Ligand binder design. Structure first.
Ligand SMILES: Nc1ncnc2c1ncn2[C@@H]1O[C@H](COP(=O)(O)OP(=O)(O)OP(=O)(O)O)[C@@H](O)[C@H]1O
Lengths: 28, 79
């Protein structure tokens, strides 16, 4: 697959830096 | 390298390894970091006893079990 902006980045960052806040939920 | 390090992967091939649970997620993170082109080095940081050695063995298992993309799959892991 491809890298998708904030989608991939927010998840990636949260996984390493913490801050799941930016992931957005599968269901709020 | 064997003069300077222990081939953790080979030990894992020979068993001599204690399986992990839960920590698969940090292992997946480890694989994802290793898969990076620039900052290729993941580091396990936290309290003593958490299972960071256990994670690195978990990494060896993923290598042994072929659960890792080829570019890391063939890796030889050393202590
Ligand atoms: N999933 C797991 N989580 C925690 N411990 C595990 C796990 N699987 C196996 N273990 C066993 O529990 C111990 C975890 O110790 P480990 O060395 O990882 O602690 P550590 O995080 O490295 O801190 P240390 O530097 O005091 O060893 C190991 O002796 C390992 O055999």
């Amino acid at each position: 697959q491809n890298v998708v902006d904030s989608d991939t980045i927010s998840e990636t960052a949260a996984r390493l830096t913490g801050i799941p806040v930016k992931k957005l939920s599968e269901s709020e | 390298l064997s003069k300077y390090a222990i081939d953790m992967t080979e030990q894992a091939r020979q068993g001599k390894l204690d399986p992990v649970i839960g920590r698969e997620e940090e292992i997946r993170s480890t694989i994802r970091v290793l898969a990076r082109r620039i900052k290729s080095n993941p580091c396990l940081i936290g309290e003593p006893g958490i299972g960071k050695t256990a994670i690195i063995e978990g990494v060896a298992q993923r290598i042994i079990d072929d659960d890792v993309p080829t570019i890391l799959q063939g890796a030889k892991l050393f202590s």
